Design a binder for this molecule. Structure first.
Ligand code: 963
Length: 130
């Protein structure tokens, strides 16, 4: 229905705003665009599902997220991809893992403080009915 389309449009607006706040945070710069294979050649072969904040914006706009849970699965993927690709003890790997974890923690914390749980519940119920 049109009321259901209004619900998903509100969800999209909410998701774009959270994503924008992550994207402008200096710590999360390396997650703003896809990992370039010319700068990191083995990435696309090791990481099966690359994910970054620009691709998240693209997926919001294509109506790929019908719930906050679906969006958070992609935020989790930005984090898990960095934990998997950079697992070493060296400072370079530890810094990207800490930034990855901080990106995930920030997204969850924004959603915990600003998302009405009845709004998410409505999205899930419209999703389950389709
Ligand atoms: C997100 O995961 C990674 C990111 C980088 C990294 O420093 N990047 C990546 C992505 C990117 C995107 C926007 C701006 C800067 C950057 C820098 C430079 N070029 C890149 O391709 C390195 C990683 O491992 C060596 C790695 O797992």
């Amino acid at each position: 229905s049109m009321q259901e389309e209004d619900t998903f449009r509100e969800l999209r607006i909410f998701l774009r705003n959270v994503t924008h706040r992550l994207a402008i945070d200096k710590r999360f710069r390396v997650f703003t665009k896809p990992v370039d294979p010319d700068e990191v050649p083995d990435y696309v072969t090791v990481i099966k599902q690359p994910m970054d904040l620009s691709s998240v914006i693209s997926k919001i706009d294509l109506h790929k997220y019908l719930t906050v849970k679906d969006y958070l699965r992609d935020i989790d993927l930005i984090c898990s991809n960095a934990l998997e690709y950079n697992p070493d003890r060296d400072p370079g790997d530890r810094l990207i893992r800490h930034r990855a974890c901080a990106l995930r923690d920030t997204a969850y914390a924004i959603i915990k403080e600003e998302l009405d749980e009845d709004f998410e519940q409505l999205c899930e119920e419209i999703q389950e009915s389709r």
